[PDB]
Amino acid sequence: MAKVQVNNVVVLDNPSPFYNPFQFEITFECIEDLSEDLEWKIIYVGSAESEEYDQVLDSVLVGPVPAGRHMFVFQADAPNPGLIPDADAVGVTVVLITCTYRGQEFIRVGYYVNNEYTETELRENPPVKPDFSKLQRNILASNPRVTRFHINWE
């Protein structure tokens, strides 16, 4: 029924400094030929407490995809620290990879992300204002959280 199947997502350049870009090698299998485009999005959850703090880091149109296995690297620039609340800067958050086909979300790959200081002084005594230039982003690549949604392939 579902025209697109997501085979795997490989998290590249992990870990990396907070300001360094996101890298993802995406594999998907096309069961049938699609006449429309497959839109991929990288969404950073700036704050667990509110959807106000979400940042679409990148969005890519892929198509017209013919039947068969396909692969691509999905790169995205780092989130904006000025849009991220202080209380959510250090610790755990979520990055999302979504795919729509005719405005309809059918796949959502989510990762837990660990933003921590590597410096002994900073990790033991974190500042009031987070120093983003010293935070390391460590994605939980071994725990991909995948959600499929029932969509219309008209």
């Binding site: 085979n7 959850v45 989510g110 959280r145």
Partner: peptide
């Protein structure tokens, strides 16, 4: 971290009205 924060992050991960599994 508190439970409410893990629950909030769980919700963001799964979205709404889908089936969630670890792995592909």
């Amino acid at each position: 971290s508190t439970e409410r924060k893990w629950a909030e992050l769980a919700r963001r991960i799964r979205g709404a009205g889908g089936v969630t599994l670890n792995g592909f």
